[PDB]
């Protein structure tokens, strides 16, 4: 009759009750008619099944007429149909247990551990909100440093669903790049999580950057890493950079400005292995604002040519759109307009303005 889905390793309780609110003889048996457990008077007799260790019941509820079956540390092989048997009639409850696990061959792989004969579909939403839908196995092909939060995968079989949450951590100096898109005036955050092997190890590093003008490459800061302690060697006055003393390599820019935009290289070396490690970082900045009757929206930094800028009212359609670096509207209709720099599928930057 009943249908229960479970998380692998979690604990679920199967509710059986009888009409008479008294202690009476009963037992449980699985799909193969194997005794799970029974009661002999006051005592509880254990069944011969391979579920012997984990399956259990609560004797507190036997007087009240409830006869629950408790299974802790669920396994996929536990998923089966179970039967509560009081000598008069039998109540039937079907159990499916799923599980989610993460492999790694930069790139990540997820496998959904499933019981036999199931027909499940699995959608998965990123921390930023990107949805990745798949079948029994999902593949996270390309990862950027920004999208490294707690991911949430919801698994659905027919009409019943189960939620899984798992963390993704993207290593900095691997081939994955870092990029941040900010509207003007916002504080900028860059994080470079270190691999657990080198986190204790010691080295030195610095960050080179290039602005709107390519005349000079500023080389913002030089810093030293000993034990798990980050100390700064030199900082430029121009960006008021903050380097975290704490071990997670954290760098903060006080507020985003157009001049503070462009590609950069962060280089970390280590006295141990003396092999130069590099990492690529980009910052793209949007300015969307109205001067008197004019409305102007420009974007600065290294953006792929393929993306497109648009100005549009949220009620109507795009009043102007080009794939260039700057967009301007004169005497625009009254309303709350918006400026978007976006690729084909998603909007990278959106700014909301009032005319």
């Amino acid at each position: 009759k009943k249908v229960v889905l479970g998380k692998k390793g979690d604990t679920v309780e199967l509710t059986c009750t009888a009409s008479q609110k008294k202690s009476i003889q009963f037992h449980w048996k699985n799909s193969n008619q194997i005794k799970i457990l029974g009661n002999q008077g006051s005592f509880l007799t254990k069944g011969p099944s391979k579920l012997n260790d984990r399956a259990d019941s609560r004797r507190s509820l036997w007087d009240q007429g409830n006869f629950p079956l408790i299974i802790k540390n669920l396994k996929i092989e536990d998923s089966d149909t179970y039967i509560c048997e009081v000598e008069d009639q039998k109540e039937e409850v079907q159990l499916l247990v799923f599980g989610l696990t993460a492999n790694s061959d930069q790139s990540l792989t997820l496998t959904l551990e499933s019981p036999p004969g199931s027909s499940p579909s699995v959608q998965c939403r990123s921390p930023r909100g990107k949805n990745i839908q798949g079948g029994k196995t999902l593949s996270v092909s390309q990862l950027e440093l920004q999208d490294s939060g707690t991911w949430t995968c919801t698994v659905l079989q027919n009409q019943k669903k189960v939620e899984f949450k798992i963390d993704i951590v993207v290593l900095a100096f691997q081939k994955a790049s870092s990029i941040v898109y900010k509207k003007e005036g916002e504080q900028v955050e860059f994080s470079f999580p270190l691999a657990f092997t080198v986190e204790k190890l010691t080295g030195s590093g610095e960050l080179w950057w290039q602005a709107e003008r390519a005349s000079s490459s500023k080389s913002w800061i030089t810093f030293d890493l000993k034990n798990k302690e980050v100390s700064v060697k030199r900082v430029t006055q121009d960006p008021k950079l903050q380097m975290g003393k704490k071990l997670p390599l954290h760098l903060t820019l006080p507020q985003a400005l157009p001049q503070y935009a462009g590609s950069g290289n962060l280089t970390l070396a280590l006295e141990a292995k003396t092999g130069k490690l590099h990492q690529e970082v980009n910052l793209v900045v949007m300015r969307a604002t109205q001067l008197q009757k004019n409305l102007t929206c420009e974007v600065w930094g290294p953006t792929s040519p393929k993306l497109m800028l648009s100005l549009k009212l949220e009620n109507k359609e795009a009043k102007v759109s080009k794939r260039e670096k700057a967009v301007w509207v004169l005497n625009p209709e009254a309303g709350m307009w918006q400026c978007l720099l976006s690729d084909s599928g998603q909007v990278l930057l959106e700014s909301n303005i009032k005319v």
Partner: antibody, heavy 122, light 113 residues
Framework: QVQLQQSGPEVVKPGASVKMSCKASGYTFTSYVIHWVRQKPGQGLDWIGYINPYNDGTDYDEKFKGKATLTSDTSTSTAYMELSSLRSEDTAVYYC???????????????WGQGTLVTVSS | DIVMTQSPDSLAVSLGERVTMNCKSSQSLLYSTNQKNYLAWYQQKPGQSPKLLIYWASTRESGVPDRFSGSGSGTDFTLTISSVQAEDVAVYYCQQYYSYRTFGGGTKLEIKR
């Protein structure tokens, strides 16, 4: 009396996509999983994919990971499948089927459609 | 995937005789918990769609007559037609539902008169 009725035969240009249909009647359309099978002329059955009508959940076989697209219209109670960039080989007969019961109790294809013949030609 | 293989290519059987049709799977289809084989058998008479014959590898559908019987366990399964009637000229397929859903190549049963 559970019926499964598919489209009629069709002609589709090479490279064009064919969207075919499968109309269900006699049960709660969102309560059981739908499957698609391809059979080429006088050849074995090739499993393609399965769609859950409840949320339009999707999983396909690797051979058809690009080609096969399964959607369902819950109101009309119909399941569709479309193949993209049809090739000469792809001329075949496609069936839609249903699981006997839900939640792994019955996963064998018990109720079947009549078949749709798509002649890939110009 | 799970590779299913059906032998023979085609079969010639005389009237009233006993039919044996084999389906061997890549990996096992037996589920340890509920001791059920996740395998099924199907008939397709010419010009028609396939028809369900055996589910769980040991049980037949209500419409199915009594002469068909399913046998085997694990990885080696067999369909047996007790006495071939003239009307059983068809091609029979086997399918697994343990993981995903894969079929066989097929055995054509032809009667020798």
């Amino acid at each position: 009396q559970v019926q499964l009725q598919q489209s009629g035969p069709e002609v589709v240009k090479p490279g064009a996509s064919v969207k075919m249909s499968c109309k269900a009647s006699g049960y709660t359309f969102t309560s059981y999983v739908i499957h698609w099978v391809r059979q080429k002329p006088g050849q074995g059955l090739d499993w393609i994919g399965y769609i859950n009508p409840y949320n339009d959940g999707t999983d396909y076989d690797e051979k058809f990971k690009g080609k096969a697209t399964l959607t369902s219209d819950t109101s009309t109670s119909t399941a569709y499948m479309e193949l993209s960039s049809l090739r000469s080989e792809d001329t075949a007969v496609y069936y839609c089927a249903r699981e006997k019961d839900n939640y792994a109790t019955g996963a064998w294809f018990a109720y079947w459609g009549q078949g749709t013949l798509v002649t890939v030609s110009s | 995937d799970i590779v299913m293989t059906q032998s023979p290519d085609s079969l010639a059987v005389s009237l009233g005789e006993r039919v044996t049709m084999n389906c061997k799977s890549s990996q096992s289809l037996l589920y340890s918990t509920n001791q059920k084989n996740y395998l099924a058998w199907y008939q397709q008479k010419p010009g028609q769609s396939p028809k369900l014959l055996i589910y769980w590898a040991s049980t037949r559908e209500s419409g199915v007559p009594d002469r068909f019987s399913g046998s085997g366990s694990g990885t080696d399964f067999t369909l047996t037609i007790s006495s071939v009637q003239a009307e059983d000229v068809a091609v029979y397929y086997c399918q697994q539902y343990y993981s995903y859903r894969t079929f066989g190549g097929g055995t054509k049963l032809e009667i020798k008169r």
